[PDB]
Ligand binder design. Structure first.
Ligand SMILES: CC[C@H]1Nc2ccc(C(=O)O)cc2NC1=O
Length: 112
């Protein structure tokens, strides 16, 4: 079970997840300029650019560690933003659409 095809699959999966973020609100770190209190209760910020960095640094050597950081993007957003916000609903939608992306990607990983 070879590392190179696995990372290719994670790269494709990450691209598919970013595609579900049409507003690109999850693709870069939360700009602390705009949200100065963000780290007061968000202990591990996460975003798709950071996930890409982690991927290339060989920090995702199994599917579940990759999926855990995606879930962090989602859970951080639900935690920080009030329920009546666009952002909160965006995280709900990303959880749904990304969940389907991840299920299919995990299936394909098991074929390897
Ligand atoms: C939606 C997740 C995370 N991202 C953000 C990006 C930009 C802003 C902004 O006020 O400009 C706010 C957020 N908030 C978030 O929770």
């Amino acid at each position: 079970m070879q590392l190179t095809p696995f990372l290719i699959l994670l790269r494709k999966t990450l691209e598919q997840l970013q595609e579900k973020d049409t507003g690109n609100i999850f693709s870069e770190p939360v700009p602390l300029s705009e949200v100065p209190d963000y780290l007061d209760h968000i202990k591990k910020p996460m975003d798709f650019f950071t996930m890409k960095q982690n991927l290339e640094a060989y920090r995702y050597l199994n599917f579940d560690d990759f999926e855990e950081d995606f879930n962090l993007i989602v859970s951080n957003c639900l935690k920080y933003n009030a329920k009546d916000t666009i952002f909160y609903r965006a995280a709900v939608r990303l959880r749904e659409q990304g969940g389907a992306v991840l299920r299919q990607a995990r299936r394909q990983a098991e074929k390897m």
